[PDB]
From Swiss-Prot:
Compartment(s) where it occurs, according to its Swiss-Prot or TrEMBL record: Cell membrane; Golgi apparatus
Organism: Homo sapiens (Human)
SS bonds (residue pairs): C60-C95
Disease linked to the protein: PrP is found in high quantity in the brain of humans and animals infected with neurodegenerative diseases known as transmissible spongiform encephalopathies or prion diseases, like: Creutzfeldt-Jakob disease (CJD), fatal familial insomnia (FFI), Gerstmann-Straussler disease (GSD), Huntington disease-like type 1 (HDL1) and kuru in humans; scrapie in sheep and goat; bovine spongiform encephalopathy (BSE) in cattle; transmissible mink encephalopathy (TME); chronic wasting disease (CWD) of mule deer and elk; feline spongiform encephalopathy (FSE) in cats and exotic ungulate encephalopathy (EUE) in nyala and greater kudu.
Major location category of this protein: membrane
A single cellular component GO annotation: extracellular exosome
Descriptive protein name: Major prion protein
Origin organism lineage: Eukaryota, Metazoa, Chordata, Craniata, Vertebrata
Source organism, top-level taxon: Eukaryota
Effect of F79S: In GSD; atypical form with neurofibrillary tangles
């Protein structure tokens, strides 16, 4: 359970291990630590329209970022543009990784 409320948004079931890998050790390393304070789940809007894949993917990102800033602002915000981009990268990856996970989950067990 994750208490949030919000104005009618749907919560993701979190990820087993949200990891970032650019190939540049800076990003990889920086995210490994900051994940402790970053979320493990994202927030998406229960839209009615059909839209396109990118719409829903990016929607989860925009909401999570936009709500997360208001969160820290209430706490006397203190973050860099890099922090926001890191938390943005991960939440963007949530949708993309789940896209991957939806595909792999199609196969029963692992051995046919």
């Amino acid at each position: 359970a994750v208490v949030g409320g919000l104005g009618g948004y749907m919560l993701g079931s979190a990820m087993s291990r949200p990891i970032i890998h650019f190939g540049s050790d800076y990003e990889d390393r920086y995210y490994r630590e900051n994940m402790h304070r970053y979320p493990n789940q994202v927030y998406y809007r229960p839209m009615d329209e059909y839209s396109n894949q990118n719409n829903f993917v990016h929607d989860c990102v925009n909401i999570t970022i936009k709500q997360h800033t208001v969160t820290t602002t209430t706490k006397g915000e203190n973050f860099t543009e890099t922090d926001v981009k890191m938390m943005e990268r991960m939440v963007e990856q949530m949708c993309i990784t789940q896209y991957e996970r939806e595909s792999q989950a199609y196969y029963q067990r692992g051995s046919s």
